[PDB]
Design an enzyme around this catalytic site. Structure first.
Site, PDB file in Angstrom:
ATOM      1  N   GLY A 116      -0.162  -7.554  -2.262  1.00 19.63           N
ATOM      2  CA  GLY A 116      -0.689  -6.504  -1.416  1.00 19.63           C
ATOM      3  C   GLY A 116      -2.115  -6.158  -1.778  1.00 19.63           C
ATOM      4  N   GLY A 174     -10.256  -4.505  -2.780  1.00 22.37           N
ATOM      5  CA  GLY A 174      -9.725  -5.772  -3.232  1.00 22.37           C
ATOM      6  C   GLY A 174      -8.268  -5.952  -2.868  1.00 22.37           C
ATOM      7  N   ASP A 225      -8.475   8.259 -10.181  1.00 28.83           N
ATOM      8  CA  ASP A 225      -7.592   7.960  -9.072  1.00 28.83           C
ATOM      9  C   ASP A 225      -6.126   7.852  -9.465  1.00 28.83           C
ATOM     10  OD1 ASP A 225      -6.592   7.335  -6.588  1.00 28.83           O
ATOM     11  OD2 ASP A 225      -7.089   5.202  -6.759  1.00 28.83           O
TER      12      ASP A 225
END
Lengths: 288, 16
Positions: free
Chosen positions: A17, A22, A132
């Site tokens: 995925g 990226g 994040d």
């Protein structure tokens, strides 16, 4: 500690995925000169910095030694920057709690909080900020052991997660551990709503506003007030007032000793959860 | 469950 790979020393087999910047591939690291094949997960970053710098960052991402902070194993610098890390077989803890909603109990959820927090605390103690941290960035080694991934990637790549960011980050672009606790709070809200999407139905450009107005994520159903209040105490306007990760690890490890008392999940007492060939060595095994 | 829950006028969660 950081291994420099040639585009030959590995092969992307599948495409697990693609997220932010990226895509992630399930590959195999073939250390030239040794029959051994190490399963790994390759990430190719979509191209303002230089190559001599990237390195100095990786050097630091491949320095995080901790059971809950996924470590960088190697890097591949060519026309693209490719990161090689140990392959985590069960996927992101976000996709996990979704396809297992009814089967995840008290003891587990609570532990994960405690683990993620231990990871965040690791980085904190080293004055390192993630930026994040989200449910989508915590991989599952085993359903009982999770770990934080993609640390320092954000700093390395400049769409930003608005819902997961603390206000000041959104307004003044200021990232500190004190914001990471805010991220944590949301992440925890994610696990508690078994993957539910935060502020779903509100537009990012608006979050900043509904936040200032004092509106925060809702109290999950399964969360006894006492648990909801720690999350909520992570979304305070005054950053230096939010729980440090050490405070969390505790407040959270203290509830895992009697899960059923802080989490009300229907049918908790009855719940259970879970390529080869030869010369398949575990990342663990190859890097002595 | 509703998307947002208010905390006003709690000075701790409402900026000014």
């Amino acid at each position: 500690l950081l291994r420099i790979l040639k585009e030959t020393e590995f092969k992307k087999i599948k495409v697990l995925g693609s997220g932010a910047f990226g895509t992630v591939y399930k590959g195999l690291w073939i250390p030239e000169g040794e029959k051994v094949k190490i399963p790994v997960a390759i990430k190719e970053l979509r191209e303002p910095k230089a190559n001599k710098e990237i390195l100095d960052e990786a050097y630091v991402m491949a320095s995080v030694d901790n059971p809950h902070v996924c470590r960088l194993l190697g890097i591949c610098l060519t026309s693209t920057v490719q990161l090689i890390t140990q392959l985590m077989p069960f996927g992101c803890l976000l996709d996990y709690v979704r396809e297992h909603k009814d089967n995840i109990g008290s003891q587990y959820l609570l532990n994960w909080c405690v683990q993620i927090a231990e990871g965040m605390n690791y980085l904190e103690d080293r004055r390192l900020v993630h930026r994040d941290l989200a449910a989508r960035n915590v991989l599952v080694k085993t359903p009982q052991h999770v770990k934080i991934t993609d640390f320092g990637l954000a700093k390395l790549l400049g769409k930003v997660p608005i819902k997961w960011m603390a206000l000041e980050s959104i307004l003044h672009r200021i990232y500190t551990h004190q914001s990471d606790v805010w991220s944590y709070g949301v992440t925890v809200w994610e696990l508690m709503t078994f993957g539910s999407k935060p502020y779903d139905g509100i537009p990012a450009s608006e979050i900043s506003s509904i936040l200032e107005k004092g509106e925060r994520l809702p109290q999950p159903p399964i969360c006894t007030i006492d648990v909801y209040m720690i999350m909520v105490k992570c979304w305070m306007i005054d950053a230096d007032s939010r729980p440090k990760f050490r405070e969390l690890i505790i407040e959270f490890s203290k509830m895992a000793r009697d899960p059923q008392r802080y989490l009300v999940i229907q049918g908790d007492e009855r719940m259970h959860l879970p390529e080869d060939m030869d010369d398949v060595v575990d990342a663990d095994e190859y890097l002595i | 469950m509703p998307p947002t829950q208010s905390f006003a006028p709690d000075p701790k969660y409402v900026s000014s």
